[PDB]
Design a protein around this ligand. Structure first.
Ligand code: CLR
Ligand code: CLR
Ligand code: CLR
Ligand code: CLR
Ligand code: CLR
Ligand code: OR9
Ligand code: PLM
Ligand code: PLM
Ligand code: PLM
Lengths: 57, 128, 338, 286, 238
């Protein structure tokens, strides 16, 4: 009766996981684009750093 | 989602024939070595047999060798097992198993404690 | 008994996949077609750290982007300084087989794990002057895989027996236990808010765990093989995952499905560790064919290739200010790339 | 005429030797793992000796042979000493390499403990110190020169020719022959064990020489090239003082073969895959 | 910048002390030879070595230190771990050899042992590692052949058509049947090991007993074979 006591926990799991809110794909996408645009200039890997400003140079 | 669905089986007779169909959904079929694994009542898992990506290399277990044909169709995306000359001592559950890595020849799938790249298996009973 | 349960489970997973297919209005790569490409990104080895004896299995930066812990298989845990290449500490470990190491956000502690399924916390106060074992945790049955500090009081650990724990260091016991996984949980990635985390197991399913409630909220089943490392997006609303089928994947916590898949035909080797950058536009991936690929997170194209290691890139880290990227491979060298 | 052809051959030889020694030294300077092993220190010493040969022994002699006369008369005394030093250093480095390969293949555990880099340094320094003790002291004291138009024909005395030949050629070739004979006994036994396992496998499959040629080819190429290059010059070198016997042109040509071996030495002692990767990187060909 | 010069002098002194300690540890590490001990639960893999100096037990692993001819050996016995082994085996690529110990007396387990040996041998990270093979409980095979029925010919149809190899030498005082069974197990494992044909690592077969002293000297001799073949490979002689 252990396999059915893991089956019933799987069932209860998938019931609690079905009943969630889901945001659309394109709004999520646009938020990701917004967050990658906003913080694009603060990235030392995307934008090169002068050698005096660089602590490794 | 990697999922496997066995099909066929049931109560049969010794000396008969049976085809086990396995449907692999949720991944690319040709990349993975795949294999068949069975479980006797009150015993452990034992490696029946195997088949590679292209399907050239095929090996079997000794005690049932020459008795089972393993066809993989890549295009149909299906794994067939042909079972002739059945024996009443060989009554078990048959699980399709998939080796976890692509483009490889090493497999670790005899684990009974919830190996999660296998199907639910099919009950195959022989009554003499 | 078991068949009505498994049929109910299958109708629930068909409802979940109907949800997931209704939600899919369009793809990310169609949206991102009018986006300027990053282009060729050339990074160079500013420093090379040496003096490790065995292979470097795991490593973790500090929160001041200054001192890194490196963990090796010789039984030595070396706290480095990245600017001046000075070994600020070297700690001899009880067990030689080490699989993870963590550095506290205040810098007071270092944790190490391994095959002896004990998380060992070391204090760095050194009021006598010698580093000593501050505590040992022996609750897990399977081996300890990745462990990360929420704070100086509570540490989250990922065992090998499909169980994640939340340890309190003062009581020395397990507060919350997460047992939802079926495959072996490889690594965990904490949120920047440290309320949630994500774990990737070996059953090709990433879970989203709440630390305070004690249960998973979401399950992701987009991969095909063993999910090796997992990493959050810097806003905490997305994560990326690397598996053994040479495909990185990007997942959303809101849409509850994969947005993009990062795959190239020429490389069929597994993916060890992935870390995002600071901005989130570059996904950095430690591949198994001895180099790192700089994928573009929005365009699914390789910027550039960090082919500086002689053996497989075991782990990959990025500083909190995004200034440099450190990789540890199995040739006992730690390259700092900028 | 003939002079043009001879100048082209000699110039190609000099450039080849310079090229190969430069590539080996540069590759070891640029790559850390090609310095991590204690073995490659000896190949560093052999590239240094061969590059001192190419830089400071071959050009002046080449110019003198092409032109016919000797350009700078007082340079001959120093030139002879540097020729003896740079040749003896190469043959002693190849003896150190053979003793290294037999210490490592003979005792596999004792080679890890005993061969601390300190012992490597002491081997390299006894090699170069024996070379400078055989070369710079007697030539400048001029014990060889006093056997009883300017030319650099220093007729060696019998004492210094026989003694220098024994300390420079004959001892290291006895060391190398006993070395590579024992290493071919070890390799032969390993091949027999592998062939036994293979043949049991083959027997199991059915019921349901190439490796030895490789071993003999490698050892044959090393021993044959070194002995074949240096033997017809130390036979003449031992004969000539004691002594018609030898014409001067002939002796010149065999001296060129002796020096020519220094071009072939990096190609032979750099067939390692790490070297081929570092030469593809460094050269930029691939 | 004087204070920063002071701090840099202090950090340099600390770095010098740590570097010296690491050099001493590098010497001790290089002197040590690692050995991974792998075997099924039926087989007496613990009973293999009786020349152990100590038997120290960690929480999830067992460590053994023994020295033969002033050469230090560490032998790591995997203890309490999960049945799935495809993730923690990657740690053990750095060892010099993998000792693999199998029970011949029970026949059902032997097939699983052959599959485990195949999975070891064809693994990507275990390609550089040689494997040293112990076919334990040979006396039990002797005692069990005289049982009226042969299990091995049931479980293996090939063993009805098999002869003893002419290179093989039987020990005095033994049954040709028992030696046929011994060498046919040995041949199964060597056909699995020769099938791949990489040439980077080899498989050393040994017939050991329940109570035997010679096993440490056997593992020493096979270590000498592994490092001699490794240097022969390294100078590209073989
Ligand atoms: C890099 C290689 C090709 C350089 C080769 C240089 C050769 C071609 C040069 C260098 C020295 C030159 C010789 C120098 C002197 C003389 C004497 C003169 O009365 C006839 C030409 C002659 C004989 C020259 C012929 C060409 C020569 C031999
Ligand atoms: C003709 C023979 C006997 C002369 C022998 C001279 C020997 C004894 C001398 C000359 C050069 C010396 C070496 C010079 C350099 C080094 C490097 C140093 O880090 C360790 C000591 C070491 C390795 C010395 C050891 C002793 C040494 C090898
Ligand atoms: C280790 C290396 C550097 C040692 C080199 C030693 C050389 C340079 C020394 C050692 C013996 C020395 C010679 C000893 C005797 C004489 C005779 C004297 O009337 C002129 C100087 C002269 C000819 C010396 C020249 C320099 C010399 C050759
Ligand atoms: C290991 C080292 C010291 C061995 C050195 C051996 C030297 C000193 C010995 C060996 C061979 C000997 C030479 C052999 C033959 C002759 C011819 C004879 O009419 C005069 C002496 C002379 C020229 C000998 C001089 C000394 C000599 C060169
Ligand atoms: C002056 C230099 C170029 C001379 C070099 C001579 C070399 C190339 C010659 C001389 C001896 C020869 C070897 C003699 C014997 C054998 C055994 C035979 O079954 C395979 C070929 C092989 C292995 C030969 C290979 C080529 C060889 C090594
Ligand atoms: C190749 N060089 C040709 C010119 C020459 C002239 C005189 C002596 C020697 C040499 C040798 C160097 C050498 C090395 C060793 C040796 O014993 C020698 O006698 C000599
Ligand atoms: C005084 C004698 C005359 C000159 C002799 C010079 C000898 C130079 C030998 C250099 C050997 C270098 C070996 C490797 C050193 C290293 O990089 O660790
Ligand atoms: C790279 C090494 C360079 C060596 C060049 C050596 C040049 C020696 C110069 C000596 C000139 C002697 C001229 C003598 C003329 C006379 O006295 O009549
Ligand atoms: C790399 C080292 C090279 C050393 C070359 C040294 C050359 C020495 C030449 C000596 C010339 C002596 C001239 C004296 C002639 C006279 O007496 O007038």
């Amino acid at each position: 009766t252990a396999s059915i006591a893991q089956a019933r926990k799987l069932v209860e799991q998938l019931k609690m996981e079905a009943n969630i809110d889901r945001i659309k794909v394109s709004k999520a996408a646009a938020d990701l684009m917004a967050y990658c645009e906003a913080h694009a200039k603060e990235d030392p890997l995307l934008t090169p750093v002068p050698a005096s400003e660089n602590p490794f140079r | 989602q990697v999922q496997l669905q066995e099909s066929g089986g049931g109560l049969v007779q010794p000396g008969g024939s049976l085809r086990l169909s396995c449907a692999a959904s949720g991944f690319t079929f040709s990349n993975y070595k795949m294999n068949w694994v069975r479980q006797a009542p009150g015993k452990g898992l034992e490696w029946v047999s195997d088949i590679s990506q292209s399907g050239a290399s095929i090996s079997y277990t000794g005690s049932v060798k020459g008795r089972f044909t393993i066809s993989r169709d890549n295009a149909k995306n299906t794994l067939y097992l042909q079972m002739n000359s059945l024996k009443p001592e060989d009554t078990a559950v048959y699980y399709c198993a998939r080796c976890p890595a692509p483009f490889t020849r090493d497999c670790f799938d005899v684990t009974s404690t919830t190996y999660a790249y296998r199907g639910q298996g099919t009950q195959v009973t022989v009554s003499s | 008994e078991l068949d009505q349960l498994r049929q109910e489970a299958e109708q629930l997973k068909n409802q979940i996949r109907d949800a997931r297919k209704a939600c899919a209005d369009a793809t990310l790569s169609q949206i991102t077609n009018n986006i300027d490409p990053v282009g060729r990104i050339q990074m160079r080895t500013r420093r090379t750290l040496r003096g490790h004896l065995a292979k470097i299995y795991a490593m973790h930066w500090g929160t001041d982007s200054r001192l890194l812990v490196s963990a090796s298989q010789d039984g030595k845990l070396i706290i480095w300084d990245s600017y001046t290449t000075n070994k600020v500490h070297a700690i001899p470990l009880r067990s030689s087989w080490v699989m993870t190491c963590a550095y506290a956000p205040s810098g007071n502690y270092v944790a190490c794990g391994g095959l002896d399924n004990i998380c060992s916390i070391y204090n760095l106060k050194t009021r006598e002057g010698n580093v000593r074992v501050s505590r040992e945790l022996a609750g897990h049955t399977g081996y300890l895989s990745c462990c990360r500090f929420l704070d100086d009081n509570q540490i989250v650990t990922s065992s090998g027996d499909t169980t994640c724990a939340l340890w309190d260091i003062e009581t020395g016991q397990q507060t919350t236990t997460f047992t939802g996984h079926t495959g072996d949980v490889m690594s965990l990635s904490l949120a920047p808010d440290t309320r949630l985390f994500v774990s990737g197991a070996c059953d090709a399913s990433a879970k989203l765990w709440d630390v305070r409630e004690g249960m998973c909220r979401q399950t992701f089943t987009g991969h095909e093989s063993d999910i090796n490392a997992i990493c959050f997006f810097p806003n905490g609303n997305a994560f990326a995952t690397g598996s053994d089928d040479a495909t990185c994947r990007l997942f959303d916590l809101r849409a509850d499905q994969e947005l993009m898949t990062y795959s190239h035909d020429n490389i069929i080797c597994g993916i060890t560790s992935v870390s995002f950058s600071k901005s989130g536009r570059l996904l950095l991936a430690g591949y198994d064919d001895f180099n790192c690929n700089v994928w573009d997170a929005l365009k699914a194209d390789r910027a550039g290739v960090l082919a500086g290691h002689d053996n497989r890139v075991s782990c990959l880290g990025v500083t909190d200010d995004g200034m440099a990227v450190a990789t540890g491979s199995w040739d006992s060298f730690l390259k700092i790339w900028n | 005429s003939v002079r043009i052809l001879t100048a082209c051959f000699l110039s190609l030889l000099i450039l080849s030797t310079l090229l190969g020694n430069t590539l080996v030294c540069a590759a070891v300077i640029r790559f850390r793992h090609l310095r991590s092993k204690v073995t490659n220190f000896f190949v560093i010493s052999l590239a240094v000796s061969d590059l001192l040969v190419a830089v400071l022994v071959m050009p002046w002699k080449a110019v003198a042979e092409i032109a016919g006369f000797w350009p700078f008369g007082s340079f001959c005394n120093i030139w002879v000493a540097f020729d003896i030093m740079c040749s003896t250093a190469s043959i002693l480095n190849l003896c150190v390499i053979s003793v290294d390969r037999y210490w490592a293949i003979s005792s596999p555990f004792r080679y890890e403990r005993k061969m601390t880099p300190k012992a490597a340094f002491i081997l390299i320094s006894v090699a170069w110190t024996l070379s400078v003790l055989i070369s710079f002291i007697p030539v400048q004291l001029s014990w060889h020169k006093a056997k009883p138009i300017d030319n650099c024909d220093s007729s060696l005395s019998r004492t210094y020719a026989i003694s220098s030949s024994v300390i420079s050629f004959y001892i290291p070739v006895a060391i190398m022959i006993v070395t590579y004979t024992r290493i071919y006994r070890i390799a032969q036994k390993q091949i027999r064990r592998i062939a036994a396992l293979e043949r049991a496998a083959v027997h199991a499959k059915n019921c349901q020489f190439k490796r030895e040629t490789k071993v003999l080819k490698t050892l044959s190429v090393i021993m044959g090239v070194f002995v074949c290059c240096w033997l017809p010059f130390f036979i003449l070198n031992c004969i000539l003082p004691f002594c018609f016997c030898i014409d001067s042109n002939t002796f010149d040509v065999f001296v060129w073969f002796g020096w020519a071996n220094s071009s072939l030495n990096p190609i032979i002692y750099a067939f390692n895959a790490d070297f081929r990767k570092a030469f593809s990187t460094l050269l930029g060909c691939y | 910048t004087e204070d920063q010069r002071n701090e840099e002098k202090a950090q340099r002194e600390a770095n010098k002390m740590i570097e010296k300690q690491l050099q001493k540890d590098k010497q001790v590490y290089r002197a040590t030879h690692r050995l991974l001990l792998l075997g099924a639960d039926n087989s007496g893999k613990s009973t293999i070595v009786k020349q152990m100096r100590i038997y120290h037990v960690n929480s999830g692993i067992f460590e053994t230190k023994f020295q033969v001819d002033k050469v230090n050996f560490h032998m790591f016995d995997v203890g309490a771990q999960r049945d799935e082994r495809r993730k923690w085996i990657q740690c053990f690529n750095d060892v010099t050899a993998i000792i693999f110990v199998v029970d011949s007396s029970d026949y059902n387990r032997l097939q699983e042992a052959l599959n485990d040996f195949k999975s070891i041998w064809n693994n990507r990270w275990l390609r550089t590692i040689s494997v040293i093979l112990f076919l334990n409980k040979q006396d039990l095979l002797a005692e069990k052949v005289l049982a009226g029925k042969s299990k091995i010919e049931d479980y293996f149809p090939e063993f009805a058509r098999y002869t003893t190899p002419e290179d093989a030498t039987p020990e005095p005082g033994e049954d040709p049947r028992v030696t046929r069974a011994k060498y046919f197990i040995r041949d199964e494992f060597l056909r699995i090991s020769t099938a791949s044909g990489d040439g980077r690592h080899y498989c050393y077969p040994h017939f050991t007993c329940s109570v035997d002293t010679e096993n440490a000297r056997r593992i020493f001799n096979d270590c000498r074979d592994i490092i001699q073949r490794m240097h022969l490979r390294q100078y590209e002689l073989l």
